[PDB]
């Protein structure tokens, strides 16, 4: 009934489902976020920061009192033939 | 192991696993080691001892020499 070689888009599911909403905005509080979230918006630079943020994992394990790394002590079993 | 080849268990390497519970670290502490290790069943101890390796220092020099052989390859 409605196929138009002119517009190939409506013909296909090209249309954004009504879930799209191109409406206004949100409060001015954004002016704050835009200021402090800027260094993480660069990409690639952020890729690196997070990977080198893996330096946290090293720091957290080099220093860790309560993970089972001690026997605590025992007298070991010989044991099948010593 | 050298001083009593009959009554000691060879050690492959140490174990380091965060998931290990305390009974685990317990049971795997063997061969007179300060921590949980794996009991070697590759027979490298008998081989290395038979050819004339008596000290840890000897083993290191071999490791360095093989590392160097690995490079020139």
């Amino acid at each position: 009934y409605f196929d138009l070689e002119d517009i190939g888009n409506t013909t296909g599911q090209w249309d954004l489902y009504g879930s799209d909403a191109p409406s206004p905005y949100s409060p001015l509080q954004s002016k704050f976020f835009e200021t402090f979230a800027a260094p993480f918006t660069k990409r690639g630079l952020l890729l690196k920061f997070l990977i080198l943020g893996g330096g946290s994992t090293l720091a957290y394990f080099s220093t860790t009192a309560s993970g089972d790394i001690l026997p605590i002590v025992k007298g070991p079993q010989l044991p099948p033939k010593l | 192991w050298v001083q009593d080849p009959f009554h000691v268990r060879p050690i492959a390497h140490a174990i380091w696993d965060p998931h290990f519970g305390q009974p685990a670290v317990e049971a795997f502490t063997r061969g007179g080691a300060l921590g949980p290790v794996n009991n070697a069943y590759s027979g490298v101890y008998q081989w290395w001892y038979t050819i004339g390796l008596r000290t840890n220092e000897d083993l290191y020099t071999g490791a360095i020499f093989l590392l160097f052989l690995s490079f020139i390859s």
């Binding site: 890729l47 990977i51 893996g54 994992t57 090293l58 394990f61 080099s62 790394i69 | 140490a14 380091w16």
Partner: peptide
């Protein structure tokens, strides 16, 4: 000592898997 390295043996998969992903989709 040996509690620093098995994690970089796990930082490495994170790094390797990421790099390879970029390589294969290029």
């Amino acid at each position: 000592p040996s509690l620093f390295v098995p994690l970089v043996g796990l930082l490495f998969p994170a790094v390797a898997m990421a790099s390879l992903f970029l390589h294969v989709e290029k």
